Design a protein around this nucleic acid. Structure first.
Lengths: 184, 411, 43, 415
RNA sequence: GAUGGGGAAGCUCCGUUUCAAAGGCCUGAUUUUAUGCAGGCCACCAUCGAAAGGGAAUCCGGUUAAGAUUCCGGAACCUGG
RNA sequence: AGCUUAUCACCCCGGAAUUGGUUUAUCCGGAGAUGGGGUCUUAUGGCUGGAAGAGGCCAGCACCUUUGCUGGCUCCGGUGCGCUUGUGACGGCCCGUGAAAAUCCACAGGAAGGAAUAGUUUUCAUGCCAGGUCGUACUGAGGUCUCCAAG
């Protein structure tokens, strides 16, 4: 068989991702949250979709069509920029910080799991920047945080913290050690 | 000139292969065939099949070059592309998890219309009525269909609505000439702007749909004939008759959902249109109503059914071997009498149509020469022998009818 | 020779071949669907 | 239900129903509209011309045979005497002595009015030895000399019979012995069989034809290669081979009636050869492939070819190189086709035991193409192992015809 | 000698099939969760470079101050549809 | 343009030393010679048509004249250590084994198609239409190349 240039490059990059010995601040990724806990994290995170551009436009025209002719609490949503998440973390305004494992330059998000372990922020490296993108009206998100919450979802969030602490942080205490990628 | 290449000129640029038509349009085969159905484009037969190819004797279908070459610039093709873009941009919304934006994509969706496609196909109204022959046959079939996962209920309800509009108009302006009840269904003939259309209606029983038939080809034919019928019916109503579209009474549609329902407001020439005037028929339960009440109302009679319950009545139409009531006021008929009164036009006597006896056969409204063979050529001997065999195969079948008539008449 | 001009549809070839083919294909996809149902109940 | 769909007259079984309530819902109704829909966009549309006419206006306007009398209708004289099939015939120019030949090795001479055997000569003694048989016999066209040629295998025997007498006979005899492939003095056994002279060859002779005079006679041998056509003459005992090549295989060769040219008739061709210039003049291309027998019109204007591939072709030697009229009616190989000498008639004897008789007017001065009309199909001949009428020859002066079948029996037909 | 690539501060040079996604044809009832295209066949490379190389087919007679296998008369042939 | 004309080569019969056949030149034959018989290619010739109606050689009769007409003959042969050129079969000279492509044809293959008011197929015969651009005059003779060549 004969493949294209770019196909050969991404296949070569795939086998290069495995066969090299890798520094332990990377490969701290790919030791990621399993299927049940990931689905359960999103069962909470899907309840806080940031109000999409169409929804925001129609509502704020509803404000105009009503209020100009003839009280609300602050609404809660997931928080999704890297400047803003690393702002929220270190201010301790973060209760659950979700980090993508696949980022275009890897160097972007390498400090973040260990800065979360430093601040005492209960983090989870979840699989897919696309999968984080879906819950946030963006193609990709790299990071998603949950600062404040409705009280109906509060107990579920606190348990999501404790499940992620037990499932992720306790199973992967060896991941701060051990250079990954020694696969023969 | 330089010596021209052989197989690129005459029949090679006059016709093109299916594969070459599909490739030139850069359109899927399905969508190529969809446009071909809408535009009324068909394969054509060249005088030389191999000169139409690039030399090859091969199983090939040839389209007209200028026909496909004329299809390329067309709004319907562009709208098919727009449907493809819409398809992925919807599954983008659905596949992500956002429902509101997807619901909004439905609101911001226009669709292709088959309006301008008929102007270029049937430029005159009498030409469209020459096609309505085949158009009304699909549509009346699709009315008598159970809705499947292939074909939605909205499709069948809209088709049945057009069917009822057609039946209402033909019964309104009194345009029937011939009827013919067969095994297949019931045929009608109608002088619609004086050009005699013909169309078939099946019997109102559940129809067994085979998995063999392709309900994607038939849906596009329905899609073209449907719009064609909408424009025909607007033209008919707004010319000589009524407002379009007419309303329907809700508690009438609850009773029959046929032809006595669907009332129509406005703001003769033939003997059939003058028949049954000042006659009131009581159609019984036993007969099919919707196939019969159309004919009564078309000619000039009036209908009172057994079904509507669930006076002036002069005839009752009953199909039972034993009839119960037997009053002196009414005349009792098996529907064959109506199916003969329309065909003749002369009001056939009801003495051969009593309930309990066998009906009439119901006809449709539709040496030296062997020695002088010698001086003919082969191009005349072949043809003459073929014409002799064609007349022989007719006359022997006529002899078969005569022999069978004699063998039955003895019994 | 007193001939009447008219149009003629040629018989669409492979009508019987494809007819029997679609008859078989429909039944095959039915059976494959049934096999899918059983194998999904083993999950 | 056994017939395949779409090659079927009705899409349904016709059924009888007493009541209108008893009419079933027709199940194969969706199938019919679907197939029509497919017929619209997938079936190729052609502009055709349907030939709405009677069959009767295809037969050419030809005169009825009753106004073209006389012509033979029924048989009169049945010649029963042979144990083998009558392959060949010949009639004298005067009109009594009908000669026959068979594979019972026996040349018999008969009458025309009675059917009595007036003469018998036996050539081969071990007859059923299949290697060589009597192929073609020819009477001398010369007025009152009575010389009969017999071709049996590799040699030609010129028999002058003891039928006639002294004046006519010794006229023939002195014409033979005047001259003194090789020409032999007949031995004792050959003197018994009434043979005046034997012309022995290397290969088998299959056909023979005299001149108008009776001095020259042409003989054709298949598989002789170059010398497949030979012109012999009795007056000098000279064997001439008139041409230095031969185009393939030759089946026939016949002289023109009056103007000096020979028509060598190959398997595929008829080649008109002049002898006063010794060249090729014309070349006939018959529409057929394989050519049995030729015959020339007595006025020397037209020509007929018979064919093993069932054709019989009317060549006009003024009109074209192609046949003027190709007629292909026979059931088997057209074995022999012959003109009548006086009356405008010609026959056609095929291998199906059937002779067809034709009337053929020829218009000399006016530039008007010859009319050919059929007359009668003559039948009754017996077929013996796929073999019908081997030869046919007309009576010289009236409309009678001599046939010869495989039924070991010659027949005479009468008006 | 372009293209792909690779040099060169560069003007431009190397290289001619090279680790190029280099394209042109066929099959089909319309492609079974319903009208969004599936399966197969073939594997070298633009182009320029010959009025003496390879190449479809035209001759004779006539005609001007000067044109002829070209014009005229006659008679031909080749190629494509 | 229509017939016709052949060396070579091949096919059948035939089986050869007592060695035969054969070239100008000694090669050929039981892997089938001489011989007997046939097939093929149209090289190149012949006859026929074009075509004698054209061209040539004469002759006679009219003329201010842009005035030509009218008759003939235009045929039958031969020959070569000749020159020019074309073609055929051979024989040497080499391990020197003898440009490419456009274009055209052919074979093997067996997909597909083909009948009862024109079945399928046109490498058969006849008939219809069309063929663009540019060069084209002349010269071309210590001093560029090349063709024709009388006694």
């Amino acid at each position: 068989v004969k493949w294209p240039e770019y196909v050969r490059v991404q296949r070569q990059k795939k086998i290069l991702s495995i066969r090299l010995k890798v520094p332990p601040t990377i490969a701290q990724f790919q030791y990621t949250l399993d299927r049940n806990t990931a689905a359960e994290t999103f069962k909470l995170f899907n309840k806080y979709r940031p109000e999409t551009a169409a929804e925001k436009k129609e509502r704020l025209t509803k404000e105009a069509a009503a209020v100009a002719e003839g009280a609300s609490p602050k609404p809660y949503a997931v928080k999704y920029g890297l400047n803003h998440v690393v702002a929220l973390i270190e201010n301790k305004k973060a209760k659950l910080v979700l980090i993508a494992n696949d980022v275009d330059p890897i160097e972007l998000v390498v400090f973040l799991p260990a800065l979360c372990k430093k601040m005492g922020v209960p983090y989870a490296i979840v699989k897919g920047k696309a999968r984080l993108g879906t819950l946030v009206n963006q193609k990709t998100s790299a990071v998603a945080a949950l600062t404040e919450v409705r009280a109906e979802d509060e107990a579920a969030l606190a348990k999501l913290v404790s499940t992620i602490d037990a499932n992720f942080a306790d199973k992967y205490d060896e991941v701060k050690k051990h250079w990954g990628g020694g696969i023969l | 000139m330089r010596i021209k290449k052989k197989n690129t000129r005459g029949n090679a640029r006059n016709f093109i292969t299916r594969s070459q038509a599909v490739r030139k349009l850069q359109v899927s085969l399905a969508d190529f065939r969809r446009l071909c159905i809408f535009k009324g484009i068909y394969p054509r037969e060249p005088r030389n099949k191999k000169k139409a190819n690039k030399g090859s004797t091969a199983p090939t279908t040839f389209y007209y070059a200028k026909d496909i070459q004329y299809l390329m610039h067309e709004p319907v093709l562009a709208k098919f592309r727009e449907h493809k873009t819409f398809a992925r941009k919807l599954t983008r919304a659905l596949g992500r998890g956002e429902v509101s934006s997807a619901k909004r994509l439905e609101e911001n969706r226009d669709s292709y219309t088959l309006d301008h496609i008929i102007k270029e196909r049937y430029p005159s109204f009498p030409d469209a009525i020459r096609d309505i022959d085949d158009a009304l046959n699909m549509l009346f079939l699709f009315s008598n269909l159970p809705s499947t996962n292939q074909v939605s209920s909205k499709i069948i309800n809209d088709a049945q609505k057009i069917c009822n509009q057609w039946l209402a108009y033909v019964a309104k302006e009194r345009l029937v000439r011939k009827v013919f009840v067969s095994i297949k269904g019931v045929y009608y003939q109608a002088n619609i702007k004086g050009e005699e259309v013909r169309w078939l209606v099946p019997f109102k029983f559940p129809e067994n749909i085979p998995s063999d038939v392709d309900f994607r080809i038939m849906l596009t034919f329905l899609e073209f004939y449907s719009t064609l019928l909408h424009f025909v019916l607007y033209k008919l109503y707004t010319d000589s008759g009524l407002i379009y579209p007419p309303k329907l009474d809700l508690k009438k549609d609850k009773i029959i959902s046929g032809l006595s329902s669907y009332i129509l407001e406005s703001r003769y020439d033939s003997p059939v249109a003058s028949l049954f005037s000042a006659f009131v028929f009581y159609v019984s339960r036993e007969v099919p109503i919707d196939i019969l009440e159309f004919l009564i109302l078309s000619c000039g009679g009036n209908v009172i059914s057994e079904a509507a319950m669930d006076s002036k009545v002069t005839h009752q139409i009953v199909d039972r071997p034993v009839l119960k009531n037997k009053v002196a006021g009414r005349t009792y008929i098996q529907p064959q009498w109506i199916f003969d009164c329309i065909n003749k036009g002369e009001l056939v006597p009801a003495n051969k149509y009593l309930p309990g006896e066998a009906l009439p056969p119901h006809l449709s409204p539709w040496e030296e020469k062997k020695l002088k063979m010698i001086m003919m050529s082969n191009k005349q001997k072949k043809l003459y022998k073929k014409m002799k065999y064609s007349n022989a195969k007719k006359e022997e079948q006529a002899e078969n009818l005569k022999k069978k008539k004699k063998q039955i008449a003895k019994q | 020779l007193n001939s009447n001009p008219e149009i003629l549809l040629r018989k669409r070839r492979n009508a019987d071949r494809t007819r029997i083919e679609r008859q078989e294909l429909a039944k095959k996809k039915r059976e494959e669907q049934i096999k899918k149902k059983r194998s999904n109940k083993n999950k | 239900e056994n017939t395949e769909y779409s090659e079927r007259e009705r899409n349904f079984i016709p059924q009888k129903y007493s009541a209108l309530r008893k009419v079933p819902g027709y199940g194969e109704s969706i199938r019919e509209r679907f197939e029509r829909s497919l017929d619209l966009y997938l079936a190729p549309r052609v502009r055709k011309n349907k030939l709405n006419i009677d069959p009767n206006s295809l037969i050419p306007e030809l005169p009825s045979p009753k106004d073209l009398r006389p012509f033979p209708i029924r048989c009169s004289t049945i010649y029963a005497g042979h144990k083998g099939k009558v392959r060949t015939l010949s009639i004298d120019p005067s009109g009594l002595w009908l000669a026959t030949g068979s594979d019972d090795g026996t040349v018999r001479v008969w009458e025309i009015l009675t059917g009595r055997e007036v003469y018998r000569t036996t050539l081969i003694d071990d007859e059923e030895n299949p290697d060589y048989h009597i192929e073609c016999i020819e009477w001398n066209p010369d007025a009152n000399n009575g010389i009969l040629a017999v071709a049996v295998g590799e040699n030609i025997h010129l028999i002058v019979p003891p039928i006639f007498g002294y004046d006519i006979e010794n006229n023939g005899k002195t014409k033979i012995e005047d001259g003194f492939a090789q020409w032999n003095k007949p031995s004792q056994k050959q003197l018994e069989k009434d043979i005046c002279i034997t012309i022995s060859c290397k290969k088998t002779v299959k056909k023979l034809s005299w001149h108008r005079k009776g001095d020259y006679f042409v003989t054709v041998q298949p598989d002789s290669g170059n010398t497949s056509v030979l012109i012999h003459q009795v007056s000098k005992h000279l064997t001439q081979s008139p041409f230095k090549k031969s185009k393939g295989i030759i089946m026939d060769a016949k002289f023109h009636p009056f103007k000096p040219q020979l028509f060598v008739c190959s398997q595929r061709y008829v080649r008109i050869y002049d002898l006063s210039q010794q060249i090729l003049v014309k070349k006939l291309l018959p529409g057929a492939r394989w050519l049995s027998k030729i015959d020339i019109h007595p006025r020397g204007d037209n020509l007929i070819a018979s064919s093993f591939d069932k054709r019989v072709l009317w060549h006009d030697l003024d009109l074209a190189s192609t046949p003027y009229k190709t007629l292909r009616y026979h059931e088997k190989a057209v074995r022999s086709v012959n003109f009548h000498k006086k009356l405008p008639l010609f026959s056609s004897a095929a291998d199906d035991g059937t002779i067809h008789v034709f009337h053929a007017t020829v218009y000399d001065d006016m530039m008007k193409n010859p009319m050919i009309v059929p007359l009668k199909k003559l039948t009754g001949h017996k077929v013996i192992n796929s073999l019908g009428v081997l030869d046919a020859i007309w009576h010289p002066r009236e409309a009678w015809l001599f046939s010869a079948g495989a039924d070991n029996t010659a027949r005479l037909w009468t008006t």
